[PDB]
Design a protein around this ligand. Structure first.
Ligand code: 3WL
Ligand code: ZN
Ligand code: ZN
Lengths: 336, 344
């Protein structure tokens, strides 16, 4: 049924040319918001990270990250390995609550400046604000702190790309800044580590060979497998939207499992385009293994289990398991 | 006979460890940069990247002090492709003090650059020698020499003369080439036959990235199954020339050949042989022979394109006469036929 997979990839691509117009309508709104946010003292160093599509099957839905550079001191929240309070060694004295930078107050002023500027188009805390341009194009804007200091110790044994993309690349990436998005912690003044910029780099520079996918001899199917993985989750989440079991699952879980599959199979020849069918089947099978065993390490923070009982109930996992297994046993009817 | 080559590489490796001199240099270099950043004209001073233009003289170091010049326009000198006048699109400019007309005076900044160097070094013990591609030569303690070059940093698109250079697409990939060309380029003061206020394009930083990240596979030389001999071949090429230059120091025939010629020829060979399996360590002997052969082919045809500036022939007869090329040709040919006795 590999030809059906490529039938899916055929349609996912044709909608991209039909939405490159939508990305222009987003760039315009974003540039105006940054102009006025930069006028404010607290957001003077605002800028962009990475348009991107968390939901691939929703081409009119974009995700933008506004970055704000800060020299911080970080305090891990309750050994979460991923959530922190951000103390200091400043334009953000506004948002200090004791010695902690308040996500709530910083998020507040963030929204208000955008809600005021958008009146020139409505607004609806990972996704801080969500805009609706006209009535078809939506964009989720996430605020993020940028720190050009060395990465937190909870990242020391993550990003295991050495045998795939090389230890030299791992040192290169780990010299880049890391990011922090305001995110509730099961607490309201915590920040969660983000590496969306690193995720994009290794997604678009994904082969052991530097010339992977730049010639016919080295066409691999890494990218096609992840898109098919995202598309199947998104389709399953929409067929069962009014049952809510699949609501806690996101494309990030699929993206993480894919990075782990890349680590397990680091050779370009294990991703030959001729083998799209079995490559995707193996990708589904690993995700299923993460569901059954309830283990899905954050690719950058290995002690952070995305699939822990405290985050997703077993009944939700077993439901997605059964649905996916039914799809695989029937040549994925949900793809149409 | 590849084992004698390994004997050479064993020798070159031993003299690098006996890195302490490099620690002395970084000390004087950091004190020197501190004092130049105090001047309004050199506030953007910094380092680009130890560098050994002569692999057989570990005591001799080469350093580049870069200085960012925002929003410049270049004007090519006499269609040389490599030497330009530097003008600015604004004026506000800290280096306005060095304009002669609308062009930045290479000699006027070089004079102040040299004056600040000799002034600050006198407070330490090392002297400053005159060389103007390297502006100064620092003699540190017993026998450490430091050649200091200043270069302007421009973050604009690379000059059009480089449009079809850096042909690494089939080797290091088209996206690596795109990435490297988004990095800045550099301009060093250099006279052009002579015109006295020109600046020459420098890509020394791109040259380092490509040598230290040289494989088609990203894990090249990171494991035993992917050990290659690219870097060893260049070492052996630079060493062969430096030895032959020393033996013939009296005939003045080899005086215009430099490690840069070897380096450039090596890059063209890397383009010719993009696959890592053509550089297996088991074939060090054959791979070095191929490198020697290509450099000889450049010598006989009098054609060595600058790896970034394809229309600049480093082996032009205006630069090195035919006799010098044929002399060096015959010497290398003799060395190869006799298992390179100049290595002994
Ligand atoms: O970076 C260099 C560039 C050029 C060059 C020569 C002709 C046309 C364009 C560039 O020559 C050099 C000569 C050297 O001896 C050396 O150490 C160098 O680093 C360079
Ligand atoms: Zn690929
Ligand atoms: Zn190598």
């Amino acid at each position: 049924g590999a030809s059906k997979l490529r039938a899916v990839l055929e349609k996912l691509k044709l909608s991209r040319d039909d939405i490159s117009t939508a990305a222009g309508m987003v760039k315009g709104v974003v540039d105006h918001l940054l102009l006025r946010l930069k006028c404010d003292s607290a957001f003077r160093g605002v800028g962009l990270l990475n348009y991107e599509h968390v939901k691939i099957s929703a081409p009119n839905e974009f995700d933008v990250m506004f970055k704000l550079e800060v020299r911080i001191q970080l305090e891990e929240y309750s050994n979460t390995r991923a959530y922190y309070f951000v103390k200091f060694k400043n334009p953000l004295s506004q948002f200090l609550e004791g010695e902690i930078l308040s996500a709530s107050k910083m998020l507040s002023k963030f929204r208000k400046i955008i809600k005021e500027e958008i009146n020139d188009v409505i607004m609806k805390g990972s996704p801080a604000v969500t805009l609706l341009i006209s009535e078809k194009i939506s964009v989720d804007i996430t605020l993020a702190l940028e720190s050009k200091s060395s990465w937190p110790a909870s990242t020391q044994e993550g990003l295991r790309i050495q045998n795939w993309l090389s230890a030299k690349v791992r040192k290169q990436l780990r010299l880049k800044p890391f990011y922090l998005v305001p995110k509730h912690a099961k607490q309201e003044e915590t920040w969660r580590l983000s590496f969306s910029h690193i995720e994009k780099e290794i997604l678009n520079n994904h082969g052991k060979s530097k010339t992977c996918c730049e010639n016919k001899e080295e066409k691999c199917c890494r990218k096609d497998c992840l898109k098919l993985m995202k598309y199947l989750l998104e389709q399953l989440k929409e067929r069962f939207k009014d049952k809510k079991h699949l609501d806690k699952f996101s494309s990030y879980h699929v993206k993480t499992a894919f990075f782990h599959v890349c680590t397990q199979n680091p050779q370009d020849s294990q991703w030959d385009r001729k083998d799209l069918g079995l490559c995707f089947d193996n990708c589904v099978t690993y995700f299923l293994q993460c569901l059954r065993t309830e283990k899905l390490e954050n690719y950058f923070i290995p002690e952070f289990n995305l699939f822990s009982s405290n985050l997703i109930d077993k009944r939700s996992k077993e439901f997605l398991t059964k649905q996916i297994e039914y799809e695989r046993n029937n040549e994925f009817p949900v793809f149409d």
